[PDB]
Design a protein around this ligand. Structure first.
Ligand SMILES: CNC(=O)[C@H](Cc1cccc(Br)c1)NC(=O)[C@H](Cc1ccc(C(N)=O)cc1)NC(=O)[C@@H](c1ccccc1)C1CCCCC1
Ligand SMILES: CC(C)CCC[C@@H](C)[C@H]1CC[C@H]2[C@@H]3CC=C4C[C@@H](O)CC[C@]4(C)[C@H]3CC[C@]12C
Ligand SMILES: CC(C)CCC[C@@H](C)[C@H]1CC[C@H]2[C@@H]3CC=C4C[C@@H](O)CC[C@]4(C)[C@H]3CC[C@]12C
Ligand SMILES: CC(C)NC[C@H](O)COc1cccc2[nH]c3ccccc3c12
Length: 440
């Protein structure tokens, strides 16, 4: 009675997919900084969604509104071949991203790919080549067709294009195209989240709660600071901070250093804090009585307040040595250090209390980047898994699943093509990128 409301919602979906994915593709094409191995795979993923929104979803909406197929038999064997192609090439790309992110975090070059940009193009071509054989060869050679009468009536009729497949195809094609790359993706990327948390480091811990500024700034106390929380001087003079900066770097800096020399200062200060923990008589027994995680929290305090200041927590150092983490967490809260900087002290106290990195989960920028990739994979799973689960259940018990439920679940996977550009807005780098492109 009212197909307009359904038709308008469908028209807004096609527009959101074409606009959103062309926006992602152009950002990677125009900006030199975005040319990376991951964004190459993002382009392959965005191209799959673009062909989805151009050549698949519009004809799928016309098929629903007209209750028939008005584009002929040739286009539908193609429309179905393209539809299966974009879903296969999407899950395989995600599987390649999860595997590529695994080797990046297990390598010494943490968060950086072991592939060159030319190898990434070779993998993408192979992905579409293998996906092309999986999607086109069964459809064009008619390896999918069923044998019953209702299916043969739809094949011989040009105005009917319901996707009837035999049970062997619906079982095999779902497993080889979707389930196998999905299970590998979920398993491998589950390990990336484990390694990111397990390989969490005091150098990344201090980077999180003190940031990085390669130009001179003032900290919460007003003192001049540069790098990763490297105190230059407590004097209000700016030449004094600049003069002390030149002595540490060995160069007239004018208050500006690079990241290569900012980390060298950071590595010096961390070693200075550790060397001060071992020399101090009060901190030495506590440090030897701690695991690697709680050792990092103790160096975090010494990094911020100095060796003499951390030794002042007389009671807290008793119980951190006495393995009584919960009691030490309360005394650490009752301190000027908690009142001064509570968000940092909260993360340190939690580290002392739980002995884990729960307070620094997804705080590092690279770990934020890995979380968004997890949302792309998780949302893709939630949108297509009900459809593919119903595929298998329909094969076992044929009478159970109606086509109204089948089309509904298929379109939940259809709207997934527009979610990727929205999820990429979690990145400040794409956010700046599309602001430039949209001229905002
Ligand atoms: C070595 N070169 C880099 O690392 C450049 C450098 C850079 C920085 C700032 C502006 C520009 Br222009 C370029 N960063 C980039 O290439 C960023 C790095 C990044 C930063 C923060 C986050 C997060 N928190 O989710 C995520 C990634 N990549 C991205 O955003 C990409 C991306 C991939 C996966 C999830 C979300 C975003 C693309 C999203 C879609 C369009 C194109 C980007
Ligand atoms: C038969 C028709 C309908 C299917 C459409 C196939 C198209 C969209 C496929 C075929 C080859 C694919 C390309 C293969 C290699 C690359 C290199 C990479 O840096 C960006 C993506 C890009 C450029 C792919 C995008 C999608 C692609 C162009
Ligand atoms: C296949 C038919 C039916 C639909 C239209 C296909 C379009 C969307 C495909 C075919 C080839 C694709 C291109 C292949 C290669 C590149 C280079 C890359 O650096 C940016 C994306 C870009 C430029 C792709 C954009 C999308 C593209 C033009
Ligand atoms: C309107 C119909 C044609 N749409 C198809 C789905 O969007 C995507 O379907 C699949 C993608 C990848 C592998 C697949 N194996 C199948 C077996 C039966 C039905 C769909 C699929 C399928």
């Amino acid at each position: 009675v009212w197909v307009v409301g359904m038709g308008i919602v469908m028209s807004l979906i096609v527009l959101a997919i074409v606009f959103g994915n062309v926006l992602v593709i152009t950002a990677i094409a125009k900006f030199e900084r975005l040319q990376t191995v991951t964004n190459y795979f993002i382009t392959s993923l965005a191209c799959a969604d673009l062909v989805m929104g151009l050549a698949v979803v519009p004809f799928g909406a016309a098929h629903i509104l007209m209750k028939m197929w008005t584009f002929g038999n040739f286009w539908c064997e193609f429309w179905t071949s393209i539809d299966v192609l974009c879903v296969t090439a999407s899950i395989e790309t995600l599987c390649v991203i999860a595997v590529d992110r695994y080797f990046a975090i297990t390598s010494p070059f943490k968060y950086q790919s072991l592939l060159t940009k030319n190898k990434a193009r070779v993998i993408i071509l192979m992905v579409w080549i293998v996906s092309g054989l999986t999607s086109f060869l069964p459809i064009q050679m008619h390896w999918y067709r069923a044998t019953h009468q209702e299916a043969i009536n739809c094949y011989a009729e040009e105005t009917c294009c319901d996707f009837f497949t035999n049970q062997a195809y619906a079982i095999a094609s779902s497993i080889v195209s979707f389930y196998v790359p999905l299970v590998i993706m979920v398993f491998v990327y589950s390990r990336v989240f484990q390694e990111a948390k397990r390989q969490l480091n005091i150098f990344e811990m201090l980077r999180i709660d003190e940031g990085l500024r390669l130009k001179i700034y003032k900290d919460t106390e007003g003192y001049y600071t540069i790098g990763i929380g490297h105190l230059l001087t407590k004097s209000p003079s700016l030449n004094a901070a600049k003069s002390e900066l030149d002595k540490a770097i060995g160069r007239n800096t004018n208050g500006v250093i690079t990241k290569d020399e900012a980390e060298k200062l950071f590595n010096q200060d961390v070693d200075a804090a550790v060397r001060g923990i071992l020399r101090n008589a009060k901190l030495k027994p506590v440090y030897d009585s701690l695991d690697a995680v709680r050792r990092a929290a103790l160096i975090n305090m010494v990094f911020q307040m100095g060796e003499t200041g951390v030794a002042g927590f007389t009671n807290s150092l008793r119980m951190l040595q006495q393995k009584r983490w919960d009691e030490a967490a309360v005394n650490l809260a009752k301190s000027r250090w908690y009142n001064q900087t509570p968000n940092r002290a909260k993360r340190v106290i939690t580290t002392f209390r739980t002995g884990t990195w729960d307070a620094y989960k997804f705080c590092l920028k690279e770990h934020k980047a890995l979380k968004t990739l997890g949302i792309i994979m998780g949302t893709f799973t939630l949108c297509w898994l009900p459809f593919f689960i119903v595929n298998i259940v329909h094969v076992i018990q044929d009478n159970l699943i109606r086509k109204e439920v089948y089309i509904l679940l298929n379109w939940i996977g259809y709207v997934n093509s527009g979610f990727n550009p929205l999820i990429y807005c979690r990145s400040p780098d794409f956010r700046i990128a599309f602001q430039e492109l949209l001229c905002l």
